[PDB]
């Protein structure tokens, strides 16, 4: 679908793209003081393109952004233990609560 | 206080002492007291210190004999 | 065990118990597929270990340690090589040597006490 | 009984198809290639290994008639 | 606490 | 602005997490080993 | 805590933090049972085991080699 | 319990049993390393044979 | 002594396997730990006899094949 | 970015069975709700003819890089460890033996190594100590 | 004993510290449970992302996009953290 | 064989300790993370867990005087004591593994214990040691990781010690040329590279961490990714061997049955 800047569906696409940018920075950079420098550099690059009207510019930028995010993706991201993909995910799931149906077998 | 290699053990004395095959060599005479001392002392590092040092030095002399042989072998190989 | 068949009984049930320990949290999809991965790679090693035992019966007529080890010097080199190549493949699977080492890191899906036991004085040392 | 299984139409369609793959099988070039490999090529390979070494492996109590270790050492220099 | 209740006698 | 979380990240390098405190005691009982060894050397004499 | 559905799921191992009310009574019986035939293992083992290196004298083995020669 | 905002984390108040046990095991290791090194530094590093007392 | 070293952990497996429902969580863990410890003390006793005294043990239960 | 596993047909024809693009269910977003959360499947979703190769129970599909790149990197690694081995062998950079290898009396312990008589000496003998 | 549970009093305390330590919040801007990000605290879209990524890191969770876009007030954030079985 | 059996016994002591002390840290952190990138500054809060890891790592690193030193140093030197082509190649492989052992041990210790805190502040106020039942086996194994190798060395490694179960052919005895013919530089070469290399690695983390932002360099990122994905072996096994193994069954099912 075409991109309409300043729309609600554009404030969710850029926001998610910014999340994946910062998470990828966090996976690669494991020191908090070093992460803040990279986190601000990423944000300033978002601020530069913040005021753009032409969708024909945004789609060129949006396609390029995913090229960088996919290229810089960490092969081993950081996942919380109980989240999907974590070390404790689906461990000791409580059983389903439902009355047993008796059968004659 | 081992200066040179001891007298070689006979075949029968090697069988009587159940010496390992790989250690039936020039120093098998010094191995018999050491394995006898090792068993009595539970192989502890502090028990049979002197008997162990004597046998280690014997293998050092057997090694240095084999160092001399290879130099001798090379001389025949170089000059042939 | 006094012979190789008794060793193979322990060899298999180590893989059986490792399968149940790695997949102990069986509601976790990762632990379930990791227990299968450890079992199948080791069962690949078991298939080679069985062949080595069949060849041992063919050449020596026995699996007892006392019989087989007395004949080691007098047996054909090729027969000796075939038996121990089969033993080498089985050793790689359990000891996680290169080629059959993929299950070893999947075995971390089990509880840490399993890891402390399997990887220290157990299954990983069976091949040695 | 009480229908203890929640029947899924897509499961039933998928399962019914997997049982009835024979209906749609065509003996085309792709099928012929796999038939030749599995029923002619591979059996021939095992066929020639079985009769090549039929009675050619007297491995019962096979003896060693040749030394394993070298007697003399020759340096490389 | 956990205070895990005890089940029926077995 | 510059480092908006600067006040939030301050605790990560202060208190117990200064460069001195983090590496202090990194060798557990090192001087106790030297002290007991020193007692052994002097008592042997 | 949670719901373990213990009304009908009673596996031999217990099913989600199962400790019966009379666990002290049963534990003593099992400890007696474990101890009783743990001695039975010891009594059997001492009778049945043997030293395979002392069953035949070295003089008996020399005759075997010559006779089989 | 109550959470204190902005307060930094000071050096922890680790129970004395945990600290002393940790320093006894660590001191036991360092003592053994120094004790073994003193009598075996020549033997270890090939600067003297074990029988050359 | 040899039968104690080998089969005592197997009895601990059975007790926590089939009698875990009857002795509860707490006592099941410790009785299994008891069975392994018996194998520990038996093994150490056998270690002295074998390594330090050159004694071999062999128990032949029955024929398999 | 994300690619399908191998041996997945691009088309099929099984009568009236619905034709759909193969979706590897292992890659589905795990933060969505499903009627079958573990399998990431909603009720009555049509199944591909080879869905068993494209679901949770199929072997995990690693797709960080293409297979050829992973196979190229895999060969590149072990190629270095073979060039390192081959440089030393051809050049002969490994050290020579500092001593003549161990030899033993009694014709190299021939009798102790299962030799019957003089015809089978070198068959069983270890290295012979020529210096008595 | 482990951490003594996680009640809404603690969750709110650990959220206020985030907003108090985030200088991008507009001057004034009393931090209240009903305070919003855009209006009360003057946070735009990208700054809202930074706050919620510090939120997920504080309680050691990962926030989906479908649910981060619906978190627009402090109270909604507090209710969300309490609605997560693995927030610590 | 005698060296292998001895190193087998010693490894079971300090490697079980390392797994036990790893599970101690994982339980202690209330988030129950297992990623060292989410650790940092743990040394003070759990000093007993750090001591067990520290001693076990030093035992693993074959630090002189410890149990790993009496079993691992001799094995590495025996590769050079073979004086064959294969022995010389494998000596360097063993030497690098010995050096890499120090490297990944220091890296694991730095990230978990000596790094600046990466976890939330709430984690560190709740970070406490576990009970005495967890601690007791670790202490018992800790002592075995200090002395045990020295006591048992003469049983398995002593020259002429009778172990007829492990048969060594007389042509293959190399324990003596291993013990007498190696240069003194090689006697300490594994110790220098591990200790010297480990210190250099530790300095970079604390003072010059900008070198480890490998996402910058594309070649470093590909070299980092290759090893982090384990030589791409798991991908090759699943995507090629297992996929084609199941596809053969499908082809047999479709085109034959
Ligand atoms: C122990 C039984 C007594 C051993 C004889 C006394 C002794 O001197 O050895 C103590 C021993 C450390 O001494 P060590 O260097 O191993 O050898 C003897 C040095 N004269 O001490 C030890 O070996 C302690 C080993 C850990 C316990
Ligand atoms: C002889 C050649 C090998 C024969 C291959 C036979 C075809 C494959 C048969 C197994 C079918 C796959 C299966 O059973 O389920 C998939 C299972 C899951 O494994 P996976 O997803 O990778 O584990 C991740 C856990 N989170 O995958 C598995 O764990 C299967 C384990 C492998 C089965 C044995 C393969 C041994 C290959 C040895 C050679 C390897 C190269 C050297
Ligand atoms: C897994 C597969 C199951 C096990 C199969 C084992 C097959 C190994 C057979 C042993 C063997 O034949 O070794 C000899 C081999 C080639 O045989 P050849 O050189 O013709 O005869 C040697 C006579 N001195 O020459 C060699 O020794 C080296 C090449 C084979 C070594 C194993 C690889
Ligand atoms: C032994 C006798 C060998 C007979 C071989 C029969 C070959 C055969 O029937 O092939 C199948 C073919 C139908 O074609 P199909 O399978 O649908 O795929 C083709 C797509 N282009 O079938 C046909 O092409 C139709 C001709 C069938 C002739 C069958 C002859 C039967 C008489 C001998 C029975 C024995
Ligand atoms: C469900 C159970 C199915 C019941 C049917 C199975 C019946 C088993 C066969 C009955 C045999 C009767 C018997 O025990 O004979 C006693 C036997 C004496 O025979 P003997 O010739 O003197 O011994 C020679 C050994 N070299 O003495 C023996 O040799 C037996 C000693 C063998 C020990 C092997 C131990 C295997 C594992 C035992 C676990 C259970 C034992 C512990 C009991 C509970 C402990 C808490
Ligand atoms: C045991 C018997 C092993 C027989 C090996 C058979 C090898 C083989 O037939 O490979 C063919 C197969 C590709 O065949 P196919 O799927 O029909 O490709 C056309 C798709 N448009 O390719 C494969 O399925 C990979 C098989 C390689 C593993 C051998
Ligand atoms: C699931 C389906 C399985 C089907 C059955 C499988 C068994 C196949 C047996 C093959 C035997 C084989 O290959 O024997 C080979 C023979 C003759 O060999 P030759 O080279 O001419 O003579 C051999 C002499 N040499 C070695 C000196 C050259 O060939 C035939 O005349 C086979 C006739 C029947 C198959 C066409
Ligand atoms: C050498 C031969 C050894 C023989 C004795 C070994 C101990 C026997 C244990 C029996 C009790 C048990 O494990 O089965 C019962 C337990 C029950 O699970 P729970 O822990 O009570 O939790 C209850 C909560 N559920 C209901 C969610 C699980 O397991 C199961 O149904 C789990 C499924 C796997 C079956 C395991 C069978 C193992 C057999 C070994 C095959 C060789
Ligand atoms: C696969 C990539 C790994 C490196 C390849 C080594 C290249 C080479 O040249 O290795 C050759 C080596 C060495 O044995 P050799 O030279 O035949 O005999 C040397 C005889 N000595 C040692 C008594 C002097 O054997 C191998 O590779 C072993 C088999 C393959 C293992 C994998
Ligand atoms: C002897 C071996 C010498 C090489 C080891 C140096 C330390 C190291 O590998 O580290 C240096 C770096 C990575 O930095 P790191 O500290 O490992 O992780 C921190 C990285 N982050 C923070 C981005 C997550 O490695 C590499 O990317 C090199 C490729 C790994 C294989 C090592 C060489 C293979 C031959």
String of DSSP letters for J11-66: ----TTSPP-----GGGS-TTS--SBTTTTB-TTPPPPTTGGGSSTTSPP---SS-
Written as six digits, the tokens of I8 are 């005592």
Any atom of ligand 8 within 6 Å of the Cβ of G13 = yes
Residue C75 has what DSSP assignment?
Answer: B
At residue I17, φ and ψ (nearest 5 deg) are -85, -45
Mapping DSSP to helix (H, G, I), strand (E, B) and coil, where does residue B39 land? helix
Distance CA J91, CA L38 (A): 49
Residues of G within an 8 Å Cβ radius of I? 10-15, 17-20, 23, 26-27, 30-31, 34, 37-38, 41-42, 44-46, 48-53
* Residues contacting residue D22 through CB under 8 Å, at least 6 positions apart: none
Mention every residue, 6+ apart, whose C-beta is less than 8 A from residue C50: C8
Count of Cβ atoms closer than 10 Å to residue C110 Cβ: 22
| Torsion angles phi and psi, residue C69, rounded to 5 | -70, -20
Give the separation between CA D69 and CA A46, rounded to whole angstroms: 73
User: Which residues have C-beta atoms less than 6 Å from ligand 1?
Assistant: B 45-46; H 39; L 147
d(C-alpha J64, C-alpha C18), whole Å:
30
User: Rounded to a whole number, what is the largest CA-CA distance in chain D?
Assistant: 89
Closest residue by Cα to residue J115 from C74, C81, C80, D70: C74
Bridge partners (DSSP) of residue G50 are: I58
Rg (CA), chain K: 13
> Which chain I residue has the Cα nearest residue G44?
I3
3-state secondary structure of G20: strand
Q: A84 is written with which tokens?
A: 């999907």
CA distance D63 to D74: 29
L159, L176 Cβ separation under 8 angstroms: yes
What is the distance of C-alpha G11 from the center of its chain? Answer: 23
Annotate I29-53 with b (16+ C-beta within 10 A) or e (fewer).
Answer: eebbebbeebbeebeeebeeeebee
Helices (H), chain L: 2-28, 47-60, 67-80, 85-109, 121-125, 132-144, 148-157, 175-180, 184-207, 218-228, 233-236, 243-255
Phi, psi (deg, nearest 5) at residue J31: -95, 5
Instruction: Return the SS3 of D5.
Output: coil
Q: Which two tokens stand for residue J4?
A: 């399908």
Between helix L67-80 and helix L2-28 the angle, nearest 10°, is 130
Q: Is B79 exposed, middle or buried (0-12, 13-18, 19+ CB in 10 A)?
A: exposed
CA distances from F8 to A33, C1, E8, L12, L31 (A): 11, 63, 53, 44, 20
CB L254 within 8 Å of CB D18: no
Please give the structure tokens belonging to residue L45.
């809060």
Kindly list the distances between the CA atom of residue L20 and the CA atoms of B13, G9, L128, L142, L214, in Å, as whole numbers in the listed order: 51, 34, 16, 11, 32
- Asked if J56 and C32 count as a contact pair (C-beta separation under 8 A), the reply is no
Q: Whole-angstrom Cα distance, residue G68 to residue E6?
A: 72
Rounded CA separation K15/K12 (Å): 5
Give the closest residue to C126 by CA, choosing from C16, C10, C1, C3. Answer: C10
Q: What angle do CA L193, L197, L203 make, to 5 degrees?
A: 160
Distances (CA, A) of F10 to D50, F23, J98: 77, 19, 62
Q: L224 alpha carbon to ligand 10 midpoint, in Å?
A: 7
Question: Is the Cβ–Cβ distance between J114 and D63 less than 8 Å?
Answer: no
Identify which ligand lies nearest to the alpha carbon of A78: 10
Q: Please give, one letter per residue, the 3-state secondary structure of J65-119.
A: CCHHHHHHHHHHHHHHHHHHHHHHHHHCCCCCCCCCCCCEHHHHHCHHHCCCCHH
- What's the gap in Å between L256 CA and the centre of ligand 7? 22
β-bridge mates for residue C64, sequence order: C3
Shortest CA distance to C20 belongs to which of A26, J51, H29, G13?
Answer: G13
Under a CB-based contact definition with an 8 Å cutoff, are residues L118 and L38 in contact?
yes
Question: Quick one: tokens of G8?
Answer: 């009908």
In contact, I6 and I36? CB cutoff 8 Å: no
Backbone angles phi, psi at F16, to 5 degrees: -80, -10
CB I26 within 8 A of CB G16: no
Q: What SS3 state is found at F3?
A: coil
Question: Which DSSP symbol is given to I54?
Answer: -
CA end-to-end span of chain K, whole Å? 15
The length of chain L in residues reads 257
CA distance I40 to C96: 27
Q: Whose CA is nearest to atom 27 of ligand 8?
A: G15
SS3 K69: coil
User: What 3-state class would DSSP assign to C11?
Assistant: helix
DSSP state of G54: S
SS3 call for F28: coil
Q: Is L97 on the interface with C (CB under 8 A)?
A: no
Specify the 3-state DSSP secondary structure of H1.
coil
To test the pocket of ligand 6, the residue of J4, J5, J6, J7 to mutate (highest count of ligand atoms within 8 Å of its CB) is J7
- L79 contacts: CB under 8 Å, gap ≥ 6: L87, L88, L90, L91, L94
User: Measured between alpha carbons, how far is A78 from L35 in angstroms, rounded to an integer?
Assistant: 7
DSSP C79-124: HHHHHHHHHHHHHHHHHT-TTS-HHHHHGGGS-HHHHHHHTTSSGG
| Nearest partner of L149 among L98, L48, L49, L75, judged by Cα | L75
| CA dist., res. L149 & res. G18, Å (int) | 43
Resolution in A: 2.9
Burial category of L138 from C-beta neighbours within 10 Å (exposed 0-12, middle 13-18, buried 19 and up): buried
CB C41 within 8 A of CB C106: no
Mutate to test the interface with H, among B57, B61, B63 (most CBs of H within 10 A): B57
Backbone angles phi, psi at K36, to 5 degrees: -90, 170
Task: Provide, as residue numbers in chain C, all residues whose Cβ is less than 8 Å from the Cβ of A92.
Answer: 25, 27
**Which residue, F2, L227, K56, L123, is CA-closest to J64?**
L227
Residue D15 neighbours by CB distance under 10 Å:
12
CA A12, chain centre distance (Å): 11
For residue I15 the two structure tokens come to 């007790």
- Rg, C-alpha atoms of chain L: 23
- DSSP letter at L246 equals H
Cross-chain CB nearest to C121 (options L16, L23, L234): L16
Burial of K59 (0-12, 13-18, 19+ CB in 10 A): buried
Helix (H, G, I), strand (E, B) or coil at B20: coil
Dist. CA B39–CA I52, nearest whole Å = 6
For ligand 1, atom 10: residue with the closest CA: B46
Beta strands in A1-104 (DSSP E): none
- Residue (of L54, L56, L61) closest to L101 by Cα position: L61
| Residues A14 and L198: beta-carbon distance below 8 Å | no
Mapped onto helix, strand or coil, the DSSP state of residue C127 is coil
Task: Determine whether B18 is exposed, middle or buried from the number of CB atoms within 10 Å of its CB (0-12, 13-18, 19+).
Answer: exposed
Structure-token pair, residue J102: 């161990």
d(CA G8, CA K9): 40
Q: Which of L70, L52, L66, L147 is nearest to L109 (CA)?
A: L52
For chain K, list the strands marked E by DSSP: none
Angle, to 10 degrees, between the axis of helix L85-109 and the axis of helix J67-91?
130
Instruction: Please tell me which of the candidates L118, L213, L229 has its beta carbon nearest to residue A75.
Output: L229
* Nearest by Cα to C40 from C124, C103, C119, C90: C103
Measured between CB atoms, does I39 come within 8 Å of chain G? no
Q: How far is CA L150 from the centre of its chain?
A: 20
Could you tell me which of L30, L122, C26, L33 has the C-alpha nearest to residue A81? L33
Q: How far is CA H52 from CA B2, B6, L87, L175, in A?
A: 11, 19, 30, 19
Give the span between the Cα atoms of I24 and L147, in whole angstroms: 39
C-alpha distance from residue C105 to each of C73, D27, L229 (Å): 40, 45, 12
CB contact under 8 A, K14 and L126: no
Instruction: Give the single-character DSSP code of F18.
Output: S
Query: How far is it, in rounded angstroms, from Cα F9 to Cα A66?
Result: 30
Report how far apart, in Å, the C-alpha atoms of J28 and of each of C69, H49, K35 are: 57, 67, 36
Query: Is any ligand 10 atom within 6 A of the Cβ of residue L220?
Result: yes
- Rounded-to-integer distance, Cα G21 and Cα G1, Å: 18
CA L186 – ligand 1 centroid, Å: 29
Residue listed under structure tokens 């509880």: C111
- Length of chain E measured in residues: 10
Mutation choice for D interface testing from J127, J130, J131 by most D CBs within 10 A: J127
Q: Does G10 touch chain A (CB under 8 A)?
A: no
Dump the DSSP string for G24-44: HHHHHHHHHHHHHHHHHHHHH
C7 lines ligand 3 (CB under 6 A): no
K23 an active-site residue?
no
The three-state secondary structure class of H30 is: helix
As given in the structure block, the two tokens for residue A44 are 């300033």
Of the candidates J114, J6, J89, J105, the residue with the CA atom closest to the CA atom of residue J50: J6
Asked if L15 and C119 count as a contact pair (C-beta separation under 8 A), the reply is yes
Task: List the one residue out of J101, J99, J120 whose CA is nearest residue J111.
Answer: J120
Q: From the CB of residue D16, how many other CB atoms can be counted at a distance below 10 Å?
A: 10
């Amino acid at each position: 679908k075409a991109v309409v800047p300043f729309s609600e569906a554009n404030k969710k696409y850029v926001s998610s793209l910014y999340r994946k940018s910062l998470r990828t920075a966090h996976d690669w950079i494991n020191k908090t003081e070093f992460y803040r420098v990279k986190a601000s550099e990423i944000r300033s690059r978002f601020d530069a393109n913040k005021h753009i009207n032409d969708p024909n510019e945004l789609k060129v930028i949006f396609k390029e952004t995913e090229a960088l995010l996919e290229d810089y993706a960490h092969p081993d991201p950081i996942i919380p233990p109980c989240r999907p993909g974590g070390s404790k995910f689906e461990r000791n799931i409580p059983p389903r609560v439902e009355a047993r149906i008796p059968i004659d077998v | 206080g081992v200066s040179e290699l001891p007298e070689l053990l006979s075949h029968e004395e090697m069988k009587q002492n159940k010496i390992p095959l790989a250690y039936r060599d020039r120093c098998a005479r010094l191995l018999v007291p050491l394995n006898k001392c090792r068993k009595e002392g539970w192989y502890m590092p502090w028990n049979c210190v002197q008997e162990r040092h004597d046998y280690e030095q014997c293998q050092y002399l057997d090694f240095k004999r084999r160092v001399k042989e290879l130099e001798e072998i090379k001389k025949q190989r170089d000059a042939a | 065990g006094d012979n190789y068949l008794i060793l193979f009984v322990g060899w298999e049930f180590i893989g059986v118990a490792s399968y149940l320990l790695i997949s102990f949290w069986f509601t976790r999809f990762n632990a379930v597929k990791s227990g299968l991965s450890a079992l199948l790679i080791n069962r690949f090693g078991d298939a080679l270990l069985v062949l080595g035992l069949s060849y041992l019966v063919l050449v020596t007529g026995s699996v007892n340690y006392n019989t087989v080890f007395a004949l080691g010097s007098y047996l054909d080199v090729n027969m000796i090589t075939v038996i121990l190549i089969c033993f080498l493949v089985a050793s790689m699977a359990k000891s996680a040597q290169l080629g059959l080492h993929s299950w070893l890191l999947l075995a971390m899906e089990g509880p840490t006490p399993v890891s402390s036991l399997l990887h220290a004085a157990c299954l990983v040392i069976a091949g040695v | 009984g009480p229908h203890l299984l929640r029947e899924d139409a897509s499961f039933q369609r998928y399962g019914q198809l997997r049982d009835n793959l024979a209906t749609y099988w065509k003996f085309n070039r792709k099928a012929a290639r796999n038939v030749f490999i599995f029923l002619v090529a591979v059996p021939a390979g095992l066929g020639y290994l079985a009769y090549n070494y039929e009675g050619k492996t007297p491995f019962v109590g096979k003896r060693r008639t040749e030394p394993i270790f070298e007697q003399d050492y020759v340096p490389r220099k | 606490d956990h205070h895990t209740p005890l089940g029926p006698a077995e | 602005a510059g480092n908006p979380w600067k006040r939030r990240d301050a605790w990560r390098s202060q208190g117990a997490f200064t460069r001195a405190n983090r590496f202090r005691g990194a060798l557990p009982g090192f001087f106790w080993g030297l002290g007991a060894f020193g007692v052994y050397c002097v008592y042997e004499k | 805590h949670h719901i373990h559905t213990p009304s009908y799921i009673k596996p031999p191992t217990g099913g989600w933090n199962f400790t019966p009310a009379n666990w002290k009574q049963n534990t003593v019986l099992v400890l007696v049972g474990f101890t009783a035939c743990c001695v039975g293992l010891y009594k059997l083992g001492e009778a049945g085991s043997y030293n395979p290196k002392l069953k035949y004298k070295e003089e008996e083995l020399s005759r075997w080699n010559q006779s089989a020669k | 319990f109550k959470y204190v905002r902005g307060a930094i984390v000071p050096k922890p108040k680790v129970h004395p049993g945990y600290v002393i046990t940790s320093k006894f095991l660590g001191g036991l290791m360092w003592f053994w390393i120094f004790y073994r090194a003193k009598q075996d530094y020549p033997v270890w590093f090939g600067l003297k044979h074990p029988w050359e007392h | 002594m040899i039968l104690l070293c080998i089969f005592t952990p197997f009895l601990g497996s059975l007790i926590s396997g089939f009698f875990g429902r009857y002795i509860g969580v707490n006592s099941s863990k410790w009785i299994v730990c008891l069975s392994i410890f018996v194998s520990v003390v038996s093994t150490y006793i056998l270690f002295i006899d074998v390594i330090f005294n050159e004694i071999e043990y062999t128990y032949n239960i029955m024929n398999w094949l | 970015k994300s690619f399908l596993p191998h041996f997945i047909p691009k088309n099929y024809s099984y009568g009236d069975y619905p034709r759909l693009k193969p979706e590897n269910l292992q890659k589905r977003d795990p933060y969505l709700k499903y009627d079958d959360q573990a399998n990431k499947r909603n009720f009555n979703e049509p199944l591909h003819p080879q869905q068993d190769d494209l679901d949770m129970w199929a072997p995990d599909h690693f797709d960080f890089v293409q297979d050829s790149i992973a196979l190229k990197w895999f060969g590149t690694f072990f190629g270095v460890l073979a060039v390192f081995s081959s440089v030393i062998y051809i050049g002969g950079l490994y050290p020579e033996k500092p001593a003549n290898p161990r030899n033993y009396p009694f014709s190299g312990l021939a009798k102790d190594l299962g030799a019957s008589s003089e015809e089978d000496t070198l068959l069983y003998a270890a290295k012979i100590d020529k210096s008595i | 004993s482990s951490t003594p549970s996680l009640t809404k009093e603690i969750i709110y305390d650990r959220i206020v510290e985030i907003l108090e330590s985030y200088d991008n919040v507009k001057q004034g801007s009393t931090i209240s449970p009903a305070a919003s990000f855009s209006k009360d605290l003057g946070l735009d879209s990208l700054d809202t992302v930074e706050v919620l990524l510090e939120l997920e890191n504080e309680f050691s969770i990962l926030i989906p996009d479908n649910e981060a876009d619906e978190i627009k007030t402090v109270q909604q954030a507090v209710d969300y953290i309490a609605a997560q079985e693995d927030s610590i | 064989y005698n060296l292998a059996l001895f190193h087998l016994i010693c490894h079971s002591f300090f490697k079980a300790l390392l797994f036990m002390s790893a599970g101690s840290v994982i339980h202690s952190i209330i988030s129950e993370y297992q990623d060292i990138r989410m650790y940092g500054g743990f040394r003070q809060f759990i000093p007993l867990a750090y001591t067990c890891i520290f001693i076990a790592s030093l035992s693993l690193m074959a630090i002189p005087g410890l149990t790993g030193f009496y079993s691992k140093d001799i094995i590495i030197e025996s590769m050079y004591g073979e004086y064959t082509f294969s022995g010389f190649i494998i000596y360097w492989f063993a030497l690098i593994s010995a050096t890499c052992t120090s490297l990944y041990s220091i890296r694991l210790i730095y990230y978990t214990f000596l790094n600046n805190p990466n976890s939330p502040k709430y984690i560190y106020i709740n970070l406490k040691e576990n009970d005495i039942v967890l601690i007791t086996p670790m202490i018992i194994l800790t002592i075995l990781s200090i002395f045990g190798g020295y006591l048992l060395r003469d049983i398995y490694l002593g020259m002429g010690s009778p172990f007829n179960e492990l048969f060594i052919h007389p042509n293959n005895l190399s324990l003596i040329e291993t013990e007498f013919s190696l240069p003194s530089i090689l006697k300490v070469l594994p110790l220098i590279t591990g200790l010297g290399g480990g210190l250099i690695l530790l300095l970079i983390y604390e003072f010059n961490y900008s070198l480890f932002l490998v996402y910058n360099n594309k070649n470093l990122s590909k070299l980092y990714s290759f090893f982090n994905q384990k030589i791409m072996f798991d991908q090759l096994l699943n995507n090629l061997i297992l996929r084609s193994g199941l596809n053969i069954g499908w082809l047999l099912n479709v085109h034959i049955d």
